[PDB]
């Protein structure tokens, strides 16, 4: 389940417009749920608007244990009804053991991000090096795991908003006392089910987040018009 208020709608439409203007890849999960659905639909909208002139690339990265229908070939197949999204032009699915295992895709994804980070293509304005930006808006464990695995690598350029669940606490906190102070007031209903033996681990996760605050930035409240996405990236 995913709620998408029109602020996020405007921001992500402006984002995919910027990524079409610059010729960038967008890495995402790629399922048929919520945000990945909406990103794929805006990809299809820009695909049908101009039809050509530097089309966009949306790589989805899935788990292979959550997939409804799996058809092994060499020969194409038809996926019908986690459900995959339609409009991602490239998909990649990680291979592992049994079915019900999330967070398997994060290792290969973060290693790929590190390799494009250390890759050098001189025909740019960054000084080669292919600049990489991470975004976070939603909530959950995998968001914090992604942000900390990103910021552990040098230069992730993590951007968050003041809109979401974990985006609220990361925007509004800027030690353990203040961590718990914001965490009990902005998300009580998830922490109603969570043991303390990993809440101290989350305090360590956010400690490694706030170790490098210069590599993090935030879209604030009163930047609600146009060009707010370019001024963040």
């Amino acid at each position: 389940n995913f709620a998408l208020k029109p602020r996020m709608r405007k921001i992500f439409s402006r984002l995919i417009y910027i990524a079409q203007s610059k010729g960038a890849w967008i890495l995402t999960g790629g399922t048929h749920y919520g945000l990945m659905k909406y990103i794929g639909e805006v990809v299809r909208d820009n695909t049908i608007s101009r039809n050509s002139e530097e089309n966009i690339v949306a790589i989805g990265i899935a788990a292979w244990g959550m997939v409804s229908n799996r058809d092994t070939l060499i020969d194409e197949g038809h996926f019908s009804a986690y459900i995959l999204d339609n409009n991602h032009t490239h998909l990649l699915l990680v291979d592992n053991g049994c079915h019900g295992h999330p967070t398997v895709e994060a290792k290969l994804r973060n290693q790929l991000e590190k390799y494009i980070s250390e890759r050098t293509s001189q025909d740019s304005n960054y000084g080669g090096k292919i600049p990489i930006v991470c975004f976070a808006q939603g909530g959950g464990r995998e968001t914090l795991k992604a942000i900390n695995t990103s910021v552990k690598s040098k230069i992730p350029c993590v951007v968050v908003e003041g809109s979401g669940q974990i985006a609220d606490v990361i925007a509004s906190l800027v030690t353990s006392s203040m961590v718990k102070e914001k965490l009990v007031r902005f998300l009580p209903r998830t922490v109603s089910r969570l043991p303390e033996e990993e809440i101290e681990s989350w305090i360590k996760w956010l400690k490694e987040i706030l170790e490098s605050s210069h590599l993090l930035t935030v879209i604030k409240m009163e930047e609600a018009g146009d060009e707010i996405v370019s001024n963040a990236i």
Binding site: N1, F2, A3, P6, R189
Partner: protein, 478 residues
Amino acid sequence: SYALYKAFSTNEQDKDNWNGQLKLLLEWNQLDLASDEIFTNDRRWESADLQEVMFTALIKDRPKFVRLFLENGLNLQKFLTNEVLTELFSTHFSTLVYRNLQIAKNSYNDALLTFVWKLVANFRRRHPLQALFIWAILQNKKELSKVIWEQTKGCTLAALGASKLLKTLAKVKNDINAAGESEELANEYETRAVELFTECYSNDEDLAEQLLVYSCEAWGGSNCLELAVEATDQHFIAQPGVQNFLSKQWYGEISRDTKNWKIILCLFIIPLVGCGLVSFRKKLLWYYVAFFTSPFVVFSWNVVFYIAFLLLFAYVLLMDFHSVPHTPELILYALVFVLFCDEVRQWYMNGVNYFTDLWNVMDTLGLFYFIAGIVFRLHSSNKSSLYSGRVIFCLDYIIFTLRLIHIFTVSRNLGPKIIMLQRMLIDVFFFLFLFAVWMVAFGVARQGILRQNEQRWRWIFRSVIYEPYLAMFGQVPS
């Protein structure tokens, strides 16, 4: 509402019933509270049992709630059955709108209103969103209609058809408040259709011209370009996109950015079709035939043929008219046979509404006078019949000459003025009314003061009507 929600939310056996919370904030108009406390944490939804509340949001006028719901997900055809339509039209559709619908069908029948009368007769007893948009628009809901219109695919066809329906229901002359309100909503949706098509023409012209010609799998059994004509939505056709389309279909192969005197010069001498003075963009024998199949040049050939026809009819009627038909009269009869078969062809194509326009009436009437002139002409050796035939041909030449005004309405210069000419009828009739009153009041008085007991009917009207009529051109009765 906020007090009732704060008491209902803090019972601790009702936190699990978020459906009751949603129905509570649905009956009242709490939008910000529902958005902030029902869909915010995104822990619980199913997108499939949100239907009855959805139906509730359709029946007690909640456009912002159904916008908030469709923002979070539903397919409307999955929501729609025929039973929803029978509830909406048999029960939720008011009897007053039904009464004005029957009055509008009896007083102002159209093809689209006949179609909607058919479908309301169907559903009181495949295009789902258009049907619910129809129900929203005849019920004058005015804000749910925008919410469903933003979800439709064939948007401009929907806007134009809704403008047609609402103008036709606005012509009804009882309950003038409903008439004015539906009139304003008609103006709003025709403005919306024009302002959308100017954008989708200002980006891409070819796909816009594809939009203009697609029938949308029998929306109302018509086209996007046809609904603006049937509604008399003449502001939709006065915009530069549709006019650019009409000009590019009117010229045919010839480019628009050339001067027209070159075009009529290449019409005047045929083998100048193969020269570099005319652009044929939008081989040589194909240039020849694609030239001769353009609409512009077949019209400008037909008018030259018509002027040559009038000169031949004048030469026959004035200078060569004997007791038996000579060669130019027979050539003339062949030309009128060609004109007659073309007119009966377009009458077979058009139908009974051909008789609606007055120019078609007087064309058929003139051909009838011509065949009457023939059957008075051929009975020779009767001087009365042979003279009456020529009188009928003169009074027919009047009609065939006055057709030329209607012929030359297409030009960029004379055209708007000839169209303007028919707006003067009420001033001409007011002038003729006052002049006839003063004419009779003077003529009878003068004829009664001067003379005594005229017993001839002709010299009553020659001296009561005719001489005061001539006294409008400065004759001064003597």
